[PDB]
Design an enzyme around this catalytic site. Structure first.
Site, PDB file in Angstrom:
ATOM      1  N   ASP A 290      -0.987  -2.982 -13.156  1.00 24.03           N
ATOM      2  CA  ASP A 290      -1.734  -2.056 -13.991  1.00 24.03           C
ATOM      3  C   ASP A 290      -0.807  -1.151 -14.802  1.00 24.03           C
ATOM      4  O   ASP A 290      -0.847  -1.210 -16.017  1.00 24.03           O
ATOM      5  CB  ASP A 290      -2.841  -1.338 -13.206  1.00 24.03           C
ATOM      6  CG  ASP A 290      -3.880  -2.304 -12.655  1.00 24.03           C
ATOM      7  OD1 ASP A 290      -3.542  -3.546 -12.522  1.00 24.03           O
ATOM      8  OD2 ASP A 290      -5.028  -1.828 -12.338  1.00 24.03           O
TER       9      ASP A 290
ATOM     10  N   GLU B 296      -3.766  -2.355   0.612  1.00 29.46           N
ATOM     11  CA  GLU B 296      -3.670  -2.871  -0.744  1.00 29.46           C
ATOM     12  C   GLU B 296      -2.194  -2.942  -1.114  1.00 29.46           C
ATOM     13  O   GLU B 296      -1.728  -3.891  -1.727  1.00 29.46           O
ATOM     14  CB  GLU B 296      -4.495  -1.964  -1.674  1.00 29.46           C
ATOM     15  CG  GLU B 296      -4.743  -2.578  -3.036  1.00 29.46           C
ATOM     16  CD  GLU B 296      -5.505  -1.822  -4.118  1.00 29.46           C
ATOM     17  OE1 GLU B 296      -6.338  -0.917  -3.786  1.00 29.46           O
ATOM     18  OE2 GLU B 296      -5.285  -2.188  -5.315  1.00 29.46           O
TER      19      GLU B 296
END
Ligand code: WV5
Length: 763
Positions: free
Chosen positions: A536, A733
């Site tokens: 990202d 994550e």
């Protein structure tokens, strides 16, 4: 065609609703679906807050997940609910037979934890829905006046499923009894069924539909003079009035005092005898044995992880990954305008493209279906393109025929241009978990082609009945090739789509390089982000600029050409294989000519300067190692070795806990949202570990250096994930490079699970 029909038949049923705690649906868009709901009830207003259905993760839920699972057989799920004082087991099993994809059974078992009041009232509901114009489903009425003393039998029929019976058994457990005046009209307390019909497209909305019925019940109490002067017990106030019949929704409700269990038996009529509880037990037992034997064969943990603790860990990481498999169906939200602004050809192109988005031309299209594993049951229970590349590497080990099913399912979505949307939000149900502002897919948005990695693994296996079916596509080379033959055109189409839509600009600036063609730039980037790359907020040339070139994207293309060569070779697409060979050649040269920094000693993205000349912009991190991560470098490359220096260097990327996304020396370290700007990500670490191992097991200059880093990196990655699992019960994550703590999102299985493959090795 024989093996293909056997896979269809085998994989049809499953608990393919990973977005809820427990539920079943077949791989048919409009068909029969089930779902489980439970909640303690202590008061007149509390159930609405306690009831559980869709997956979430708060202080209220200690954890949950699959302890064993195979989509062909079934599995056992454990739910630890603090809010409701309950430890629940959901065991699910498939019984092959008939013409219609077999039968299945489930057992729901609930045990109060030590904290829960021994006399807890817990409402349990089994919700059943059927979509289709020409399908029927009927609750057989009971003998007794107010509900059921015994089993609830639903008889149904549909073209897709033939005739079937779905039975919810009476259960073991104290069922509480009311001495109130209402028992004269509602019974003292018993199992109940409400049969209802709503228009097909709202059937999935089980919570509202249920609440609407409870509300009508309470309304009826108030109309009929039951008040605060003398009220029935809460649990009796929320017991539905029994009204079985026919409809496309069937609400089956029970209330228990103390511990409980009950069974769901789905009996395919086209099969032999109907399914029994005694059946469910045998098959549950049998499935476990098979799971056990296959795990030890497929996931043989090598040192130092041979211990039983690591085995439980692997079994948990594996079962949660494969257990996330879902079937999704419906319309997608896509902008099909193809606005010129999405060409991103100008300086400032991100405001152009925002203007086009603000035209809101998107519309629903499809329906589509997808059969896929997911990153996150509580937060994003849906398919992500480059994620699935990673999910399927362990799955492919377990059941290559399964993984190929999923690949097929993904490739079936590809449109005429070559595009697959990188996020699959299919249908109203999927959309309910996603703000409208973030539903829209864009035909110009790519995503690392990581699915090609799985194909790469299948291709090496192909060169060198649930038992048979799992590997039928490698054991029968005819079958294997026929798959690739059919898939190949689509692979090639996608390859072309990258070169058509994700092209960089060489020819239009002062840019010298071996090839005039090879240059790539991810469409979709904003000032601070580049979501399409997967990473990202990893720092990119500032400001973003149409002259940008991204070394990760080029390397992904390299990944694809190399696969096209292997697959082309196998099909003899000679014309094609030669095109590929010239392209792979140019990328090799072009990676160096456009992206290599001799000053920094790594690969960098590029932009063009204020004076319109090509600059390198170096940010030492995952991006900088890309050519190496994707296996494009020769094992004796001087550059490779320079990269091994970077990988190993503690003051840059090497943390006790894994490789840092971004170097501690980079200015953008731990800034902003700090997503890909320091944390340790298992998917990219997995690529690093696989590539180290390759170098470690070959003759060449770096063999011993690679071997050392392999050894240690494997250790650090596995231990970090395992310690966190031990402490918290969760896969995370990403992981903190300073503390080793897991952070961001829990239940990330999800590529974190690649840990089972890291432990078991012999890559
Ligand atoms: O795993 C998929 C995807 C990967 O492809 C990327 O590599 C990765 O960089 C980001 N992740 C996660 C994307 C999350 C979707 C957005 C809705 C989630 C809403 C929320 C935000 C905080 C908690 O809940």
């Amino acid at each position: 065609s024989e093996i293909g029909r056997l896979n269809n038949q085998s994989l049809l049923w499953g608990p393919y609703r990973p977005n809820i705690y427990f539920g079943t649906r077949p791989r048919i868009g409009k068909s029969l679906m089930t779902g489980l709901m439970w909640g303690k009830i202590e008061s007149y207003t509390d159930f609405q807050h306690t009831v559980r259905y869709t997956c979430e993760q708060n202080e209220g839920m200690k954890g949950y997940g699959w302890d064993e699972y195979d989509p062909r057989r079934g599995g056992i799920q454990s739910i630890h609910d603090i809010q409701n004082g309950l430890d629940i087991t959901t065991s699910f099993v498939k019984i092959p037979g008939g013409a219609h994809g077999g039968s299945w059974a489930a057992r729901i078992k609930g045990t109060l934890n030590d904290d829960a009041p021994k006399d807890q009232k817990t409402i349990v509901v089994f919700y059943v829905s059927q979509e289709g114009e020409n399908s029927e489903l009927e609750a057989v009425p009971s003998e007794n006046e107010f509900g059921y003393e015994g089993d609830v039998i639903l008889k149904g029929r549909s073209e897709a499923l033939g005739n079937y019976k779905l039975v919810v058994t009476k259960g073991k457990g104290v069922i509480p009894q009311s001495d109130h005046d209402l028992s004269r009209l509602r019974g003292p307390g018993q199992t109940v069924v409400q049969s209802l019909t709503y228009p097909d497209e709202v059937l999935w909305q089980a919570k509202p539909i249920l609440f609407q019925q409870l509300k009508a019940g309470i309304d009826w109490l108030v109309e009929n003079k039951y008040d605060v002067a003398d009220p029935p017990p809460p649990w009796q106030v929320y017991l539905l009035a029994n009204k079985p019949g026919s409809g496309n929704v069937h609400i089956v409700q029970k209330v228990f005092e103390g511990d409980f269990e009950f069974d769901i038996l789905f009996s395919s009529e086209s099969a032999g005898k109907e399914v029994t509880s005694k059946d469910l037990e045998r098959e549950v037992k049998q499935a476990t044995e098979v799971f056990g034997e296959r795990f030890a064969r497929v996931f043989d943990l090598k040192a130092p992880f041979q211990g039983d603790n690591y085995k439980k860990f692997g079994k948990s990481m594996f079962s949660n990954l494969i257990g996330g498999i879902g079937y999704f169906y419906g319309h997608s939200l896509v902008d099909r305008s193809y606005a010129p602004e999405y060409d991103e050809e100008n300086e400032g192109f991100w405001e152009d493209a925002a203007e086009a988005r603000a035209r809101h031309q998107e519309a629903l299209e499809g329906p589509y279906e997808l059969f896929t594993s997911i990153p996150s049951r509580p937060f994003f229970p849906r398919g992500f393109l480059w994620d699935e590349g990673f999910h399927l590497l362990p799955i492919a080990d377990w059941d290559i025929d399964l993984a190929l099913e999923i690949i097929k399912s993904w490739y079936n979505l590809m449109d005429e241009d070559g595009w697959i949307a990188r996020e699959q939000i299919l249908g109203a149900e999927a959309r309910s978990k996603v703000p409208k502002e973030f539903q829209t897919q864009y035909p110009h948005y790519a995503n690392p082609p990581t699915l090609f990695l799985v194909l790469d693994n299948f291709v090496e296996r192909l060169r060198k009945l649930d038992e048979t079916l799992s590997t039928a596509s490698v054991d029968n080379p005819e079958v294997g090739l026929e798959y690739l033959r059919r898939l190949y055109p689509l692979l090639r189409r996608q390859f072309d789509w990258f070169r058509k839509t994700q092209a960089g600009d060489i020819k239009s600036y002062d840019r010298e390089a071996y090839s005039t063609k090879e240059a790539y730039r991810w469409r979709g980037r904003t000032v601070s982000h580049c979501l399409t790359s997967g990473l990202d907020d990893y720092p990119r040339p500032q400001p973003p600029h149409p002259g940008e070139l991204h070394v990760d994207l080029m390397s992904w293309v390299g990944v694809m050409v190399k696969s096209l060569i292997s697959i082309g070779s196998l099909l003899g697409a000679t014309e094609d294989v030669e095109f590929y060979t010239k392209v792979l050649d140019a990328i090799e040269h072009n990676l160096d000519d456009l992206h290599w920094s001799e000053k920094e000693g790594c690969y960098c993205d590029a932009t063009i300067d204020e004076f319109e000349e090509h600059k390198l912009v170096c940010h030492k991190g995952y991006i900088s190692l890309f050519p190496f991560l994707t296996g494009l470098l020769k094992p004796d490359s001087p550059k490779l070795g320079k990269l091994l220096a970077l990988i190993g260097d503690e003051s840059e990327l090497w943390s006790p806990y894994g490789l840092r996304s971004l170097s501690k020396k980079d200015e953008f370290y731990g800034t902003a949202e700090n997503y890909w700007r320091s944390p340790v990500w298992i998917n990219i670490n997995y690529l690093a570990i696989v590539q180290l191992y390759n170098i470690a097991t070959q003759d060449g200059p770096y063999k011993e250096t690679a071997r050392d880093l392999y050894t240690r990196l494997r250790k650090n990655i596995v231990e970090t994930v395992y310690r966190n699992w031990e402490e918290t019960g969760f896969a995370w994550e990403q992981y903190n490079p300073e503390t080793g703590k897991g952070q961001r999102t829990q239940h990330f299985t999800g590529w974190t699970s690649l840990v089972v493959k890291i432990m078991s090795g012999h890559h």
